[PDB]
Design a protein around this motif. Sequence first.
Motif, PDB file in Angstrom:
ATOM      1  N   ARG A 153      10.060   4.249   4.541  1.00  0.00           N
ATOM      2  CA  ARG A 153       9.748   3.354   5.658  1.00  0.00           C
ATOM      3  C   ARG A 153       8.591   2.408   5.303  1.00  0.00           C
ATOM      4  O   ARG A 153       7.682   2.788   4.572  1.00  0.00           O
ATOM      5  CB  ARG A 153       9.404   4.173   6.913  1.00  0.00           C
ATOM      6  N   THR A 154       8.657   1.164   5.775  1.00  0.00           N
ATOM      7  CA  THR A 154       7.574   0.189   5.550  1.00  0.00           C
ATOM      8  C   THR A 154       7.187  -0.385   6.886  1.00  0.00           C
ATOM      9  O   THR A 154       7.990  -0.436   7.818  1.00  0.00           O
ATOM     10  CB  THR A 154       7.942  -1.023   4.653  1.00  0.00           C
ATOM     11  N   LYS A 155       5.950  -0.846   6.957  1.00  0.00           N
ATOM     12  CA  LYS A 155       5.413  -1.396   8.176  1.00  0.00           C
ATOM     13  C   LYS A 155       4.457  -2.519   7.758  1.00  0.00           C
ATOM     14  O   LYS A 155       3.714  -2.366   6.789  1.00  0.00           O
ATOM     15  CB  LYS A 155       4.674  -0.264   8.887  1.00  0.00           C
ATOM     16  N   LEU A 200       0.872  -1.167   0.000  1.00  0.00           N
ATOM     17  CA  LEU A 200       0.000   0.000   0.000  1.00  0.00           C
ATOM     18  C   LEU A 200       0.921   1.231   0.000  1.00  0.00           C
ATOM     19  O   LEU A 200       1.542   1.544   1.019  1.00  0.00           O
ATOM     20  CB  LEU A 200      -0.873  -0.015   1.261  1.00  0.00           C
ATOM     21  N   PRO A 201       1.028   1.936  -1.146  1.00  0.00           N
ATOM     22  CA  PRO A 201       1.884   3.121  -1.244  1.00  0.00           C
ATOM     23  C   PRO A 201       1.146   4.318  -0.675  1.00  0.00           C
ATOM     24  O   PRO A 201       0.179   4.800  -1.256  1.00  0.00           O
ATOM     25  CB  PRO A 201       2.142   3.252  -2.754  1.00  0.00           C
ATOM     26  N   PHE A 202       1.599   4.792   0.472  1.00  0.00           N
ATOM     27  CA  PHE A 202       0.942   5.906   1.129  1.00  0.00           C
ATOM     28  C   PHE A 202       1.896   7.068   1.343  1.00  0.00           C
ATOM     29  O   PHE A 202       2.978   6.895   1.898  1.00  0.00           O
ATOM     30  CB  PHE A 202       0.361   5.424   2.472  1.00  0.00           C
ATOM     31  N   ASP A 203       1.494   8.248   0.876  1.00  0.00           N
ATOM     32  CA  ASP A 203       2.279   9.471   1.056  1.00  0.00           C
ATOM     33  C   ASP A 203       1.636  10.197   2.253  1.00  0.00           C
ATOM     34  O   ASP A 203       0.575  10.810   2.105  1.00  0.00           O
ATOM     35  CB  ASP A 203       2.175  10.344  -0.198  1.00  0.00           C
ATOM     36  N   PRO A 204       2.265  10.135   3.445  1.00  0.00           N
ATOM     37  CA  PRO A 204       1.778  10.769   4.683  1.00  0.00           C
ATOM     38  C   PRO A 204       1.642  12.292   4.591  1.00  0.00           C
ATOM     39  O   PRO A 204       0.653  12.875   5.047  1.00  0.00           O
ATOM     40  CB  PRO A 204       2.838  10.395   5.724  1.00  0.00           C
ATOM     41  N   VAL A 205       2.651  12.932   4.007  1.00  0.00           N
ATOM     42  CA  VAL A 205       2.665  14.382   3.868  1.00  0.00           C
ATOM     43  C   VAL A 205       1.476  14.896   3.064  1.00  0.00           C
ATOM     44  O   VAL A 205       0.756  15.806   3.498  1.00  0.00           O
ATOM     45  CB  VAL A 205       3.959  14.846   3.183  1.00  0.00           C
ATOM     46  N   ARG A 206       1.278  14.306   1.889  1.00  0.00           N
ATOM     47  CA  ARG A 206       0.187  14.691   0.997  1.00  0.00           C
ATOM     48  C   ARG A 206      -1.131  13.996   1.310  1.00  0.00           C
ATOM     49  O   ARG A 206      -2.183  14.421   0.833  1.00  0.00           O
ATOM     50  CB  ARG A 206       0.572  14.390  -0.445  1.00  0.00           C
ATOM     51  N   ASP A 207      -1.062  12.941   2.118  1.00  0.00           N
ATOM     52  CA  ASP A 207      -2.233  12.144   2.485  1.00  0.00           C
ATOM     53  C   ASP A 207      -2.841  11.595   1.195  1.00  0.00           C
ATOM     54  O   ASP A 207      -4.035  11.732   0.917  1.00  0.00           O
ATOM     55  CB  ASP A 207      -3.247  12.988   3.268  1.00  0.00           C
ATOM     56  N   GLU A 208      -1.978  10.974   0.402  1.00  0.00           N
ATOM     57  CA  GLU A 208      -2.376  10.381  -0.856  1.00  0.00           C
ATOM     58  C   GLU A 208      -1.941   8.922  -0.901  1.00  0.00           C
ATOM     59  O   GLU A 208      -1.044   8.493  -0.161  1.00  0.00           O
ATOM     60  CB  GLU A 208      -1.736  11.141  -2.026  1.00  0.00           C
ATOM     61  N   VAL A 209      -2.602   8.170  -1.774  1.00  0.00           N
ATOM     62  CA  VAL A 209      -2.322   6.764  -1.987  1.00  0.00           C
ATOM     63  C   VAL A 209      -2.006   6.623  -3.474  1.00  0.00           C
ATOM     64  O   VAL A 209      -2.547   7.355  -4.300  1.00  0.00           O
ATOM     65  CB  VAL A 209      -3.556   5.888  -1.625  1.00  0.00           C
ATOM     66  N   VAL A 210      -1.115   5.703  -3.814  1.00  0.00           N
ATOM     67  CA  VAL A 210      -0.774   5.484  -5.207  1.00  0.00           C
ATOM     68  C   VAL A 210      -1.405   4.159  -5.613  1.00  0.00           C
ATOM     69  O   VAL A 210      -1.206   3.136  -4.948  1.00  0.00           O
ATOM     70  CB  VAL A 210       0.755   5.437  -5.420  1.00  0.00           C
ATOM     71  N   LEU A 211      -2.198   4.201  -6.685  1.00  0.00           N
ATOM     72  CA  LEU A 211      -2.890   3.020  -7.210  1.00  0.00           C
ATOM     73  C   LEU A 211      -2.336   2.635  -8.580  1.00  0.00           C
ATOM     74  O   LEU A 211      -1.923   3.504  -9.359  1.00  0.00           O
ATOM     75  CB  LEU A 211      -4.391   3.307  -7.353  1.00  0.00           C
ATOM     76  N   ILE A 212      -2.299   1.344  -8.877  1.00  0.00           N
ATOM     77  CA  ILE A 212      -1.823   0.939 -10.189  1.00  0.00           C
ATOM     78  C   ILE A 212      -2.988   0.344 -10.974  1.00  0.00           C
ATOM     79  O   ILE A 212      -3.792  -0.422 -10.441  1.00  0.00           O
ATOM     80  CB  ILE A 212      -0.619  -0.064 -10.108  1.00  0.00           C
ATOM     81  N   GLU A 213      -3.107   0.736 -12.235  1.00  0.00           N
ATOM     82  CA  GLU A 213      -4.179   0.230 -13.080  1.00  0.00           C
ATOM     83  C   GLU A 213      -3.608  -0.772 -14.066  1.00  0.00           C
ATOM     84  O   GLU A 213      -2.606  -0.497 -14.718  1.00  0.00           O
ATOM     85  CB  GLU A 213      -4.837   1.376 -13.857  1.00  0.00           C
ATOM     86  N   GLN A 214      -4.247  -1.933 -14.169  1.00  0.00           N
ATOM     87  CA  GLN A 214      -3.811  -2.965 -15.101  1.00  0.00           C
ATOM     88  C   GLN A 214      -4.978  -3.913 -15.346  1.00  0.00           C
ATOM     89  O   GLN A 214      -5.903  -3.983 -14.540  1.00  0.00           O
ATOM     90  CB  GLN A 214      -2.619  -3.736 -14.535  1.00  0.00           C
ATOM     91  N   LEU A 230      -0.769   6.577  11.706  1.00  0.00           N
ATOM     92  CA  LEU A 230       0.357   6.327  10.810  1.00  0.00           C
ATOM     93  C   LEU A 230       1.012   7.658  10.440  1.00  0.00           C
ATOM     94  O   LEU A 230       2.245   7.773  10.427  1.00  0.00           O
ATOM     95  CB  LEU A 230      -0.110   5.591   9.548  1.00  0.00           C
ATOM     96  N   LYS A 231       0.184   8.659  10.155  1.00  0.00           N
ATOM     97  CA  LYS A 231       0.683   9.982   9.813  1.00  0.00           C
ATOM     98  C   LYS A 231       1.500  10.556  10.971  1.00  0.00           C
ATOM     99  O   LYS A 231       2.596  11.080  10.764  1.00  0.00           O
ATOM    100  CB  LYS A 231      -0.474  10.935   9.481  1.00  0.00           C
ATOM    101  N   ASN A 232       0.974  10.445  12.188  1.00  0.00           N
ATOM    102  CA  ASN A 232       1.677  10.974  13.351  1.00  0.00           C
ATOM    103  C   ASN A 232       3.011  10.290  13.541  1.00  0.00           C
ATOM    104  O   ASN A 232       4.009  10.930  13.841  1.00  0.00           O
ATOM    105  CB  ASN A 232       0.830  10.817  14.614  1.00  0.00           C
ATOM    106  N   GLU A 233       3.018   8.982  13.349  1.00  0.00           N
ATOM    107  CA  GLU A 233       4.219   8.182  13.497  1.00  0.00           C
ATOM    108  C   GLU A 233       5.275   8.548  12.450  1.00  0.00           C
ATOM    109  O   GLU A 233       6.466   8.625  12.750  1.00  0.00           O
ATOM    110  CB  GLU A 233       3.832   6.708  13.379  1.00  0.00           C
ATOM    111  N   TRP A 234       4.841   8.788  11.219  1.00  0.00           N
ATOM    112  CA  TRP A 234       5.773   9.126  10.156  1.00  0.00           C
ATOM    113  C   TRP A 234       5.977  10.631   9.966  1.00  0.00           C
ATOM    114  O   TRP A 234       6.756  11.046   9.112  1.00  0.00           O
ATOM    115  CB  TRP A 234       5.322   8.477   8.842  1.00  0.00           C
ATOM    116  N   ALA A 235       5.295  11.443  10.771  1.00  0.00           N
ATOM    117  CA  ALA A 235       5.419  12.895  10.674  1.00  0.00           C
ATOM    118  C   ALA A 235       6.857  13.373  10.926  1.00  0.00           C
ATOM    119  O   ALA A 235       7.326  14.265  10.189  1.00  0.00           O
ATOM    120  CB  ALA A 235       4.463  13.574  11.658  1.00  0.00           C
TER     121      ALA A 235
END
Lengths: 202, 201
Positions: free
Chosen positions: A116-118, A56-70, A197-202
């Motif tokens: 970082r990954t969790k 799950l690609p999550f950008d904490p700063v932007r609060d966005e997720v990256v999705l792949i289409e296929q 998660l955001k707080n932890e990676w802030a």
Amino acid sequence: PVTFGKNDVEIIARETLYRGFFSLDLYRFRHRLFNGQMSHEVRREIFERGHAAVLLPFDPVRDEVVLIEQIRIAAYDTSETPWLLEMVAGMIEEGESVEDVARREAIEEAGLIVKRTKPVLSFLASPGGTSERSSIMVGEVDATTASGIHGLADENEDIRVHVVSREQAYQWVEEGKIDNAASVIALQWLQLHHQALKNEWA
Amino acid sequence: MLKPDNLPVTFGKNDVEIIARETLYRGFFSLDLYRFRHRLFNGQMSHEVRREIFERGHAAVLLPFDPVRDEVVLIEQIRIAAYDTSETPWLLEMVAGMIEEGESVEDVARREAIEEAGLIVKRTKPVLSFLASPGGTSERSSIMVGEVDATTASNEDIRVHVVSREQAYQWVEEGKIDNAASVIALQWLQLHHQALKNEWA
């Protein structure tokens, strides 16, 4: 809760009904019934296709997720379109770890170098007919760097990256616009843990 | 003419052509080979692609929820395919069953709730329909929440387990409940429980 274990199962034999890229195996076994007695011999056709690592690609700063289409042709008969919005994922080979498969796939599929990954959750897609297990990892990503379409396609894996806000990705799940198990589970998990998660990676 | 349907994706069914499906193995479950060509993101049409797809039908899933007592009713049963990657093949699951010819997801969910957990479901509400693993199987499972009185729950193959919603959810978090249908349904329930309890108040 559950008290029965592997000693309450007697696997009589396993056989491969078909062996190609994937395999279809027949498990013949006996197991303990809830009254304590053993069952007759039971036959079960199981789909064997290895196991997966999901990221799950999550950008904490932007609060966005990256999705792949296929394209997922198997989705054809029950979906409006076989092209799905998914998580980064890949099959776990030899002795690869779920983390390295997840991180390597983020590069190949989304052109993202995970920071970082969790670990998240590990699930059985459909225990009734396939042995497949998928282990989800959430990976810290900088959404502004995802790759675009490939000029010379990888016809075995043609992917288009989509960056959306976490809230919209979650809404699409609620709406059924994202409906593959790995993405649903991962995004529901994110919705339930994003502030922490955001707080932890802030 | 009518405007096309909206898609959150780039291509639709008109952008792929299925050449044919060949049966690799036929049992009660089958393994087929889909042969097809599809548009590529670079605007070109692909070469033929061959994929082996496990065809095993589709399922209806029911999350038995008692909003007043805030409890969930789980069923326990062996799933031999879980053997190789789990401590035990006996899993905690939602009420479920295959959808057959001429049956709605709700018909199946209500029937299965009676024969698996001895539950008489009251109101039902569609939750979510998911593809178990679209890369290898066509299987689609539709989840519904069934309103139940957890006190009326009730077998040599399936054992009933009534626990609080928080216990069920905590079990998902700890990995004790890890089949896709239950994880999705219980995560959904954890995110919507108060709204649902108010709706069914």
